[PDB]
């Protein structure tokens, strides 16, 4: 937190924020661009809810409660709760606790996005398939 | 393998190969979707059949499989190299990964461009990494409801073994303070492992 | 190699292995008692009233059987008896709590009952005392 | 000792001189086909060949026939 | 018989197929391969071009896949991969044509026939930059570095390349320039900064210790003589049984070596350069330790690209016995130079040596050996770019986009032309269409869509437009910086149009015993 | 109308996202573009009723899992 100010609800709850508004991005591009943001959207949603399953409080809980706190006119950074974006991780259920030791700073979470995508980028990148005898 | 196998070495051509390679990716990451978090399971790997760990940890738990196919094996240097990185993100990275990489091959080869289809999972990056930096909501503890006596209460909270966020704020706030060598790496650090937390029964 | 298999396929295997071992001994504890014999592969005749002997001098296998001579190994070293008590009390509780309570669907909260039955047990017991 | 009978061994010399005749055949009067000598039983190559000497001699004789033709061409 | 017919539609049935997998060129397509092989070893790898040079196959139509790519190296040295790939596309003509009943002579003609036309309609497409102009050359470097993985040591690059070829050219359009005469060589340490463009020759051997002549004055040493000492190839009469009577011949042995080393020192020589293979042990690895204090360099065992260069450019000849005295054919000289460079290397540089107004060599440096690695594959491409210029210039469409562009002027041609071989031709403009569509196919899921679509955005453009294949969008494709030389896809449309020929031409089945 | 068919579904989406409008794709042209201003007319009222008819027919079929059939 010292090294960089910046600083989100990290584990898989900034992801959960960000697939609604990459998905509102999405869209408004349109042609082929709509397809490769949105499944790079629908990604970040999974995580949250594959983590609740865990604690045994469930996707279908999950999901729930959260998107609503979002909305089209809360796509807000601010700096104080009008709507929820973080999620405790442990309570696998969102909270209004907003400085648990479940989140982790920007940091981490950046390079978390970076190396998910650069898998698929990566099997891709050969050019040519052949055996060898 | 699946398919015909006229030849070998993870080949075999069309379709098949490209299934092939997907559901394995897919294997990987579902031991680690059950691992994932602090609220991660145990596994237990047996290493021969008169050895077992337990593990917890997603990088961990990638390192002592056998590689056999070309997915299994960018995946799994993937996990082990953000575990060199940081060593957090460990249990999330690969699962986000299972799914992004299945979707793509289907939309880079559905090409105008191939460096304009790649580009555009780069343009939803930008953003949320933009967003991440913007932000400063939630985990500020700098800023926060009291500084660092808050994050290390709320901290122990979510950790607790009895009573805790009581005399184990208070600490937390004392050992980074109490190092008074900066570590300029971005702005200033302590170290804390540079502290001194001994035991008494 | 890697070998895939997942939720409740996993867990039924771990029962089915642990109670084979703990029924036995579950009647060679008290002040009765049972034998099991073990048929050699070499032939010949070894029983016990210890279940731990007979899995060590042949069949072990990967999930509950490993974890039944390792946890009763520590037990010897510390006390010196009740080495025929843990592995019964392991089974039995893995037996009748798993099944139930995964088709009702709650792995999670079942961990979070053996906390709670740990709690209550060492209060009472202690009050026997 | 092997017997091969009167109608048979009249096939064997016809077969034989008809398939390494088709070799030379096409190199012979103006530009036409070509051959193209496929090894891969000595050595594993590919020749370019014009010349009759080269693809008769290469390709071995193992039909009776066969062997005393390529010798008296 | 029925040996020509089926054995015509498998070898094509075969390469084809294999041309099929292996079009999934340029850019993130297709999906990794980890091999294991038929000798049970671990291989991975990336990139088109280094795989088809690498590829091992037994099947004798296959083989024309890899050797094409070499020759490629060769002349271009710029469109590996791509000569292969529009060679698939004329297999796929070859089957149709089988069909409708015209023979396999007649197939072999029409690509003679497409390649006359083709070839001069991409010179006309072309804009015809100078070969000696370095501004043109500069922009044209660019194109082929940030194409490759390099996109920031490509700032570097792109200068030294024009400036190397410069020393080697000759003023002409004909055939001139080659890296027989371009001598790349590798050197531990350094940077991608350091990377040094000597203009005369410079030679890759190992050089025993450090602490040798880096200054001027030599006189550059081929040799191909062993010493006469005793226990060499001089007499003694002291025969040994004995560690003590071994410690003296080796001692006396060594002892009169260091006298021969004067001898060598007194011809000027700073360099000397030991033949490859030995007349007994060559120069003892006595003598090598001794010549390092005269300050002359050694290397003992050395390769045979160095063997080729100094005889020819240099002049240097063979010289005779030292007890003899050296026979002064040595060429001229004025640089021994042992290059370390942060801690590292070990070098040769000639300077002052006689050209025949040729050969350059370019020093590949980086501190670690990947680092070379990124050098050396970028540069070697940036080289070669400006290289082809020379040899025939002008700059036509990139990444293989002319050869979409050339199918649509070429239909018309073969449709007044009007010969058994309009058809032939024809049939292979729609078949270049292929590449983008082709390349992309493999990949995913969903295949037809995407196919028919590039093939209408290039087209439509027109004669002078299409899409970009290298930035994608339908913009103007002959100069925007997506360019390549003429001679690369001349040149490719040439070797594709032999190889496939080569497939019909035989006939019944051919395997020597 | 002779397009990629997935290509397309996501451009008129962009325009339902920067105006809200009426762009769909056209087979009364065989293009894509606003479809009111091309004077593809058509009444409201047969889009009423296919909504209407596909959610009916549809939730019968997926609370139906279990049938009893008899070839009496």
Redesign the interface.
């Known amino acids: 937190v010292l090294e960089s100010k910046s600083v989100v609800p990290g584990g898989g709850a900034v992801e959960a924020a960000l697939s609604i508004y990459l998905e509102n991005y999405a869209t408004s591009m349109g042609s082929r661009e709509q397809l490769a943001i949105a499944e790079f959207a629908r990604s970040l949603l999974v995580i949250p809810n594959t983590l609740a399953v865990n604690a045994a409080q469930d996707s279908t809980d999950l999901v729930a409660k959260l998107r609503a706190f979002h909305n089209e006119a809360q796509v807000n950074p601010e700096r104080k709760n009008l709507k929820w974006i973080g999620l405790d991780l442990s309570n696998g259920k969102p909270r209004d606790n907003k400085q648990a030791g479940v989140f982790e700073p920007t940091i981490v979470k950046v390079k978390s996005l970076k190396f998910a995508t650069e898998a698929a980028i990566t099997i891709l990148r050969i050019d040519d398939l052949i055996k060898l005898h | 393998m699946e398919g015909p196998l006229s030849v070998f070495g993870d080949r075999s051509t069309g379709e098949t190969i490209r299934s092939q390679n997907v559901m394995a990716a897919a294997s990987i990451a579902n031991i680690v979707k059950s691992s994932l978090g602090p609220v991660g399971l145990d596994k237990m790997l047996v290493d021969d059949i008169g050895d077992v760990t337990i593990t917890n940890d997603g990088a961990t738990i990638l390192k002592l499989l056998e590689v056999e196919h070309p997915a299994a094996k960018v995946l799994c240097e993937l996990a082990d190299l953000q575990d060199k990185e940081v060593g957090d993100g460990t249990t999330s990275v690969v699962i986000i990964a299972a799914e992004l990489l299945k979707n793509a091959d289907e939309l880079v080869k559905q090409k105008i461009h191939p460096t304009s289809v790649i580009s555009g999972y780069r343009l939803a990056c930008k953003e949320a990494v933009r967003y991440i930096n913007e932000n400063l909501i939630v985990n500020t503890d700098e800023l926060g409801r009291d500084c660092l006596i808050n994050a290390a209460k709320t901290s122990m909270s979510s950790k607790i073994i009895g009573i805790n966020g009581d005399f184990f704020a208070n600490m937390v706030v004392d050992a980074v303070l109490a190092i008074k060598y900066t570590d300029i790496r971005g702005q200033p650090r302590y170290p804390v492992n540079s502290v001194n937390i001994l035991k008494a029964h | 190699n890697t070998k895939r298999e997942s939720g409740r396929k996993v867990q039924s295997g771990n029962i089915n292995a642990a109670k084979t071992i703990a029924d036995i001994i579950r009647t060679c504890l008290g002040p009765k008692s049972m034998m099991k014999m073990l048929l050699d592969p070499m032939g010949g005749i070894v029983m016990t009233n210890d279940g731990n002997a007979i899995l060590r001098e042949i069949q072990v296998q990967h999930p509950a059987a490993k974890s039944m001579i390792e946890i009763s190994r520590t037990q010897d070293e510390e006390v010196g008896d009740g080495t025929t008590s843990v592995i019964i009390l392991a089974g039995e509780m893995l037996s009748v709590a798993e099944h139930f309570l995964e088709q009702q669907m709650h792995p999670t909260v079942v961990i979070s009952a053996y906390r709670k039955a740990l709690d209550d047990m060492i209060s009472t017991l202690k009050k026997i005392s | 000792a092997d017997e091969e009978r009167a109608e048979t061994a009249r096939l064997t010399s016809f077969i034989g001189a008809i398939a390494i005749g088709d070799l030379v055949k096409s190199t012979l009067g103006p530009k036409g086909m070509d051959k193209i000598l496929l090894s891969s039983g000595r050595d594993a190559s590919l020749m370019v060949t014009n010349d009759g000497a080269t693809i008769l001699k290469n390709i071995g004789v193992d039909n009776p026939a066969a062997k005393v033709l390529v010798d008296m061409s | 018989?029925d040996?020509?017919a089926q054995i015509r539609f498998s070898n094509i049935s075969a390469a084809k197929?294999?041309a099929?997998?292996?079009r999934?060129?340029?850019?993130?397509?297709?999906?990794?391969?980890?091999?294991?092989?038929?000798?049970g070893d671990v291989?991975?790898?990336?990139?088109?071009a280094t795989?088809?040079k690498?590829?091992?196959?037994?099947h004798?139509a296959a083989?024309?896949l890899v050797e094409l790519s070499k020759a490629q190296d060769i002349e271009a040295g710029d469109g590996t991969?791509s000569v292969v790939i529009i060679a698939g596309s004329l297999l796929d003509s070859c089957t149709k044509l089988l069909q409708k009943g015209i023979h396999?002579?007649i197939i072999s003609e029409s690509f003679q026939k497409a390649l006359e036309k083709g070839i001069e309609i991409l010179t006309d497409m072309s804009r015809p930059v100078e070969l000696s102009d370095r501004e043109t050359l500069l922009n044209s470097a660019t194109t082929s570095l940030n194409s490759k993985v390099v996109s920031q040591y490509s700032s570097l690059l792109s200068p030294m390349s024009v400036n190397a070829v410069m020393k080697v050219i000759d003023p002409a359009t004909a055939t001139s320039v080659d890296l027989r005469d371009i001598k790349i060589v590798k050197k531990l340490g350094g940077t991608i900064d350091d990377c040094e463009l000597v203009e005369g020759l410079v030679l890759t051997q190992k050089v025993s210790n450090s602490g040798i002549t880096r200054v001027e004055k030599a006189k550059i040493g081929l040799i191909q003589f062993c010493l006469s000492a005793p226990k060499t190839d001089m007499d003694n009469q002291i025969v040994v049984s004995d560690y003590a009577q071994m410690d003296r011949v080796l001692r006396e042995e060594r002892a009169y070596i260091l006298n021969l080393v004067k001898q060598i020192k007194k011809t000027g020589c700073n360099v000397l350069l030991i033949q490859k293979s030995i007349l007994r042990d060559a120069l003892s690895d006595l003598a090598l330790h001794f010549l390092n204090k005269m300050k002359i360099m050694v290397i003992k065992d050395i390769e045979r690209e160095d063997i080729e260069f100094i005889c020819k450019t240099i002049g240097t000849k063979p010289v005779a016995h030292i007890d003899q005295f050296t026979a002064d054919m040595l060429g001229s000289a004025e640089l021994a130079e042992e290059v370390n460079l942060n801690g590292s290397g070990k070098l040769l540089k000639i300077t002052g040596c006689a050209s025949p107004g040729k050969t350059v060599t370019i020093v590949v440096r980086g501190s670690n050996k990947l680092v070379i690695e990124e050098a050396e594959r970028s540069i070697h491409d940036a080289l070669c770019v400006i290289r082809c210029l020379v040899k025939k210039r002008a700059l036509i469409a990139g990444g293989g986009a002319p050869e979409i562009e050339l199918a649509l002027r070429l239909t018309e041609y073969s449709r007044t032309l009007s010969g058994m071989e309009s058809y032939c031709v024809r049939a292979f403009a729609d078949a270049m269409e292929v590449i983008?569509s082709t390349l992309?196919?493999?990949?995913?899921?969903?295949?037809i869509?995407?196919v028919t679509?590039?093939r209408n955005?290039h087209a439509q453009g027109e004669k002078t437009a299409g899409?970009?294949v290298?930035?994608?969008?339908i913009s103007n494709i002959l100069e925007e910086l997506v360019v390549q030389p003429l001679l690369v896809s001349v040149s490719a449309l040439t070797l594709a149009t032999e190889t496939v020929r080569?497939i019909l031409?035989?006939?019944?089945?051919?395997?020597?015993? | 109308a002779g397009f990629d068919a997935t290509n397309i579904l996501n451009k008129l989406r962009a325009r339902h996202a920067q105006g809200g409008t009426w762009y769909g794709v056209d087979i009364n042209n065989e293009d894509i573009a606003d479809n009111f201003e091309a004077f593809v007319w058509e009444p409201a009222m047969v889009r009423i009723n296919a909504l209407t008819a596909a959610s009916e027919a549809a939730c019968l079929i997926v609370s139906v899992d279990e049938t009893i059939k008899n070839p009496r």
Not at chain 5, 54 to 58: E, P, S
Not at chain 5, 440 to 447: H, I, K, R, T, Y
Not at chain 5, 470 to 473: A, E, F, L, S, V
Not at chain 5, 505 to 513: E, F, G, H, S
């Open positions: 018989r040996k020509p197929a294999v099929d997998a292996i999934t060129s340029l850019g993130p397509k297709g999906m990794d391969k980890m091999i294991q092989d038929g000798k291989t991975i790898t990336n990139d088109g795989i088809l690498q590829m091992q196959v037994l004798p083989r024309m991969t396999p002579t983008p992309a196919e493999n990949a995913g899921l969903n295949p869509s995407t679509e590039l955005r899409i970009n290298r930035k994608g969008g080569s031409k035989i006939d019944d089945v051919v395997n020597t015993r």
